[PDB]
Design a protein around this ligand. Structure first.
Ligand SMILES: Cc1ncc(Cn2c(C)c(CCOP(=O)(O)OP(=O)(O)O)sc2=O)c(N)n1
Ligand SMILES: Cc1ncc(Cn2c(C)c(CCOP(=O)(O)OP(=O)(O)O)sc2=O)c(N)n1
Ligand SMILES: Cc1ncc(Cn2c(C)c(CCOP(=O)(O)OP(=O)(O)O)sc2=O)c(N)n1
Ligand SMILES: [Ca+2]
Ligand SMILES: [Ca+2]
Ligand SMILES: [Ca+2]
Ligand SMILES: [Ca+2]
Ligand SMILES: [Ca+2]
Ligand SMILES: [Ca+2]
Ligand SMILES: [Ca+2]
Ligand SMILES: [Ca+2]
Ligand SMILES: [Ca+2]
Ligand SMILES: [Mg+2]
Lengths: 524, 524, 524
């Protein structure tokens, strides 16, 4: 067998059947003879390729396979890899290299010092030293991406390797099963459970790895048993809990002082599947107030090591959440009271308040909708106004890198064809990965894109305000016609300049057969 | 509090009380006001510093703390770090940096791009961006070294940081407990146990992480219950099993074909705490023969990913070995028969056969002796001839890097003052870290060093022979007087030119109050 | 032809005929069939291998070729590479890698991510992607080491590559000539010359790249023409000027304020072949005083970029010094007056003052002696007391990394068999690379080693004093018998406990046929 044939067999045997890519010449020997049982999803720029794959992996809860065009293609994707690193997304990023005989002279398309290129944003990065090693290296890549803590990996392959003979002993790779589905030993788990049972006023904080593990329901049971309020850890990349459950308390503000104040009076705070914590703004003060003990369960040693406070346990989130939910006592304390209904912001017949948009989406979208957020000045309101009952219902750029949501929404929609995906994206953010729209059109992936157009980088204007920073350039983005961009890439386009038009456009979009972009005129 | 005071409090609270070091000017502000409850162990060269610390950490089963002199000191230690990486040794390697105001100009002793220096041989490498971050960075270093898979880490600290004010909120670091003591979830563990119970002819292979976890006794119970022969994985850095237990089958040869042949007919092979596998020689063939399934339990994702065959489970070795030992059924198969007595090699009244040396050591050493091996051509015979009943009884350079055993034997002896350490080191190997002898003399650490002097790099002569490689230079090391070297560093020195002298010298050494070096004239 | 044959032909054609090494198994296929016209110089530890090669390269003014044992051997050499980077030493560091078929599984002796290991201390680091690339990669290594700014490079070669067929087109590599012997364009050079001619009180500062270029005599002419005092740049790795020439002003103290004060009143300061500047101690103040302009000529862009003041020209030091010396006008100013005779320190019949040692060496050593310094507390006095008339007469660890001088003195002596090498090394420093002594004995390289034994790390005690740092551990190194160490490695050993014995021992050493070590009892 060839390296090509063996590698595709390995991929298939390991459950991979889709290649997200933008091709180049070093990849043609890999992509030729493309298997009939595989899917290739083309995108027009590599940030888009990787964003789509990332959404697909996050929603599918399985690795996604990517093929990029040597160094330039890899490089174009590195912002997308920054997000994937923070979301623990299991991405197998492959790129073609020059033929081995031309690497030394640094022929055009040689990826120099290739393994160092995507560092430090990958868990493992490698170029094999021979053709026959390629299937083994691919096996390593699959497993490295997939073991907890999951994350992106990089493999560079000289294009002449594919046609070479494989090692027959590579057949041992095909059916390897590698598990990291582990939990704390019984003795220490019993100690933890006793501490939770004995807490007088516990609180729970959940991060994205809960949703990635589909541990959401177990966390609901845990919160009900402990009668504990539940927050989502700051800068949330995913939604780990039903947002109208009575225990839910919403998104934590991303500040040191704000979080210790929120946790004041809680004697034990159990954090599951989050860094401790993904703060953002400068908000100095106490990490925790006196009387609060924090215990973190994380899938990532790097998270456990860097937490500035608390105990930590490094284990699989699904295994731990299930064990804890089934072991803790039912507290006789009263169940927390549900958060009040959000206020309705006054809305005239002109430009839309973002709150109006979210309320309308919540009114009109199906109960199993999936939202993506890259409307950076409106996140807090979005989190308050969308009832997200189910797992896998929310994604936000995990490293804060714009250009995620537009392509990721396409990948999520590909992963979840029965769940309507609605990406709410600011006018500024929409441009970073605008060409991803084409993939939705070409493959008829029926994502809805809601562009919040206020003509400015609003979140930056806000942050400049708190700085009292004057004379900052580059904050306004006037003069972008998103309906024309959608037309450019073959996506049906609608406008919403007021509330009646927003409702009309959403109705039309929700009943459409393909992707739809709605340009919403929002308040500045 | 100062950064200095806070950092030493963190170290003490995290169980660190000893600094292994060779000082330099960038470290003086760290080392000044050295706490009265800490120990400083000086060694004269940094390979020695790190080797001593490594032995101490491996034997103590806890992190060891190191302080080195900027880039040159770090650099001198990098061979030692190669071994530490392969042994999963929890080493906290710190080095001083120039004062922040002088880093830009690259003053003498500036460690340029410091974090990259020890890569790729460390789990984490870092220089803090401010003085107040230093205690937090130290906390990260401690935990990164200590979480499974354990390994060396590197922290570079500008020397002016120590006297600066610490963040009062660093007190939250002091008592953090971070656990990776995890095992496979119950459902999947039950599947594994059923596969082990149903095996008709199981075999077990154990690696160094068993001994590091002190899982040895649990592995004995597991082997007895399964009635399974037990091998030590190739290139063994430690001894994970009693070498005269009836199930023991010795050290696996480090070859692909040799290992699959040894495993032929075993339907399930359970590997615990080893890479799969640390082959060495070129020995092409089948990874496994038809009819053998391999299942690996490893603490290291990188091991699990790169195994060319088998299933894998990534978990703590102690937690897994204990669980498996207590869950498997007692097989009614007959217990394996003990290996036969090794042959006595004919020995005249002249130079010693290595087999004679090992037999004599086994006859005369206490039953709780600890051996170290850096006598590279004699390893197979050593493994056959020493009865090592207890855990922590054997160490060998885990990356094959010479210069480990001489200093490591000092660290092991410091860790285990009641267990006589005997380092068996070739004449070639002895030179790499010869100055470590001084530390044994200075601190009166009573290691015994047995130098196997055959005047040559024997293992290289052997490997050249199998290559039929002629005209290789540099293989002979005549003209080294090890008794004079020992005198040079203040260590009592004896000779053994024949068997009667070997016995006499060993008797004298075993009753000595300090370290002793015996130069043994061995056959060429 | 094989890769082996082609590579050795390339080396020979490029002027390389000596391999400095410590062998390992991955190197045996390279070292076999070793050419009869090549020399192999064995050393017993890799810091020693590289130090010897470094001295040889620095003194010979040509590249030196090194072969080390995979990752551990490379790692053991990294402190030595730190010095080589700072001295711009042209070192071609090669290491063997595992056979390509065993790299993926990370067999013992696999150098993982090999090219990253010696970073950031090398100019170029590489592992070829195929056997036929190896000669080309070797060519790259040779030229990268040799082009200005010269420095160490690293090449890792899988051991199976050597026996493979070479590309016949590799013959084009053999006779490539690559020049960086460049100087500033005429127009801009004329501007510089006019600025020098018009200076009213010029000063010159010279660094190690002057001596490396053998630009010393040109710099003498330049200083005579400009009637300018000449200093050696701080932390000097080499001696770039005759130390009893009337213009000579000695070693600059390595402090910001001290240097600007020394330069006060000099309107133009021309620095040649030095960083600006290799400061060490914290000595804050002005980089230059008002009225001083600095112009630097450096071979290294990294030096030019980081200078905090002055103009810079990046060019070959030999070409620039020759051009400037021949273009500047003869000033009618008076030639600077020679520095006064150093004082004779009172010396009783007991332990030696270091000043006495240097005065005696200066009295008894030949006029073409070569000195090495690793007696860290005595450098200033050494520089005042040795008349070094010729180029290539002084070496000191360029990165401050101890363990350089003992092996480097052997390499220098090998390079300059007609010039007596005398290494003056502290008792502390002597231990780092002590085993290098064996190479001097084995190859009968007649270096003289003068060990300054004061029982302590004196320079650290001094630096602690200025810090008022109390309770620093690890500063004393009692109990080392250097005569026994010399005996250990087969080197003739003498003692000097007083002045009469020092004279007697030096007389005996200077007339000896082999290497000699003299242990001198110096004041504490
Ligand atoms: C790749 C990239 N570039 C720039 C930014 C900086 N950035 C920018 C440019 C923001 C403004 C986004 O504007 P928007 O129109 O999408 O939404 P708002 O008007 O609601 O802020 S928010 C923010 O962090 C970024 N995070 N990521
Ligand atoms: C740091 C380093 N350098 C070189 C080697 C190469 N090496 C060398 C030099 C060996 C010979 C050791 O000789 P010895 O006298 O200690 O023992 P034997 O004579 O029993 O082989 S075995 C081997 O792998 C190495 N492994 N590590
Ligand atoms: C490899 C390494 N380790 C440690 C040091 C720190 N160091 C040490 C240990 C010095 C003392 C050397 O003592 P010596 O006996 O050789 O000479 P003096 O007594 O004259 O200082 S000077 C100094 O910078 C270093 N520069 N390089
Ligand atoms: Ca509503
Ligand atoms: Ca799906
Ligand atoms: Ca906007
Ligand atoms: Ca016996
Ligand atoms: Ca102990
Ligand atoms: Ca030997
Ligand atoms: Ca004199
Ligand atoms: Ca010469
Ligand atoms: Ca000294
Ligand atoms: Mg490095």
């Amino acid at each position: 067998a060839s390296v090509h044939g063996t590698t595709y067999e390995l991929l298939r045997r390991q459950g991979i059947d889709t290649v997200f890519g933008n091709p180049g010449s070093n990849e043609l020997p890999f992509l030729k003879d493309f298997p009939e049982d595989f899917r290739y999803i083309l995108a027009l720029q590599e940030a888009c390729v990787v964003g789509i794959a990332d959404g697909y992996a996050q929603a599918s809860r399985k690795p996604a396979f990517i093929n990029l065009a040597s160094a330039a293609g890899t490089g174009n994707a590195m912002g997308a890899l920054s997000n994937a690193w923070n979301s623990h997304s299991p991405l197998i990023v492959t790129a073609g290299q020059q033929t081995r005989a031309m690497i030394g002279v640094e022929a055009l398309l040689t990826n120099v010092d290739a393994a160092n290129l995507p560092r430090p944003l990958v868990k493992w990065s490698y170029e094999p030293a021979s053709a026959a090693e390629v299937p083994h290296a691919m096996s390593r890549a699959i497993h490295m991406a997939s073991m907890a803590p999951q994350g992106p990996v990089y493999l560079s392959v000289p294009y002449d390797d594919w046609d070479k003979d494989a090692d027959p002993q590579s057949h041992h790779l095909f059916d390897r099963h590698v598990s990291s589905s582990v939990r704390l030993n019984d003795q220490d788990l019993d100690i933890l459970v006793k501490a939770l049972n004995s807490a007088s006023n516990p609180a729970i904080v959940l991060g994205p790895d809960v949703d990635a593990a589909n541990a959401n329901a177990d966390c609901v049971m845990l919160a009900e048993r402990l009668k504990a309020p539940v927050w989502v850890a700051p800068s949330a990349p995913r939604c780990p809990f039903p947002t109208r459950h009575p225990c839910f308390r919403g998104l934590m503000p991303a500040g040191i002082a704000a979080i210790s104040q929120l946790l004041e009076g809680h004697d034990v705070v159990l954090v599951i599947g989050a860094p401790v914590f993904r703060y953002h703004q400068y908000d100095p003060g106490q990490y925790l107030k006196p009387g609060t003990r924090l215990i973190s369960v994380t899938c990532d040693p790097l998270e456990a090591a860097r937490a500035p406070m608390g105990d930590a346990i490094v284990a699989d989130i699904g295994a731990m959440a299930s064990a804890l939910a089934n072991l803790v006592e039912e507290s006789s304390r009263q169940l927390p009271t549900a958060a009040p209904e959000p206020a309705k912001v006054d809305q005239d017949a002109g430009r839309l308040h973002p709150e109006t948009v979210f309320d309308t989406l919540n009114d009109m979208a199906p109960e199993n909708a999936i939202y993506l957020n890259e409307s950076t000045s409106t996140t807090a309101q979005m989190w308050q106004r969308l009832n997200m009952r189910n797992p896998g219902s929310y994604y936000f750029c995990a490293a804060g890198g714009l250009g995620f949501a537009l392509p990721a929404a396409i990948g999520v929609q590909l992963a979840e064809p029965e769940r309507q995906v609605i990406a709410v994206i600011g006018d500024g953010s929409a441009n970073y990965s605008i060409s991803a729209l084409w993939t939705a059109a070409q493959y008829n992936i029926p994502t809805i894109f809601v562009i919040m157009n206020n003509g400015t980088y609003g979140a930056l204007r806000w942050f400049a305000g708190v700085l009292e920073a004057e004379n900052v350039p580059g904050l306004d983005v006037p003069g972008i016609d998103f309906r024309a961009l959608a037309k450019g890439y073959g996506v049906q386009a609608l406008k919403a300049d007021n509330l009646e038009q927003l409702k009309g456009s959403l109705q039309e979009a929700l009943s459409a057969k393909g992707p739809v972009l709605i340009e919403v005129s929002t308040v500045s």
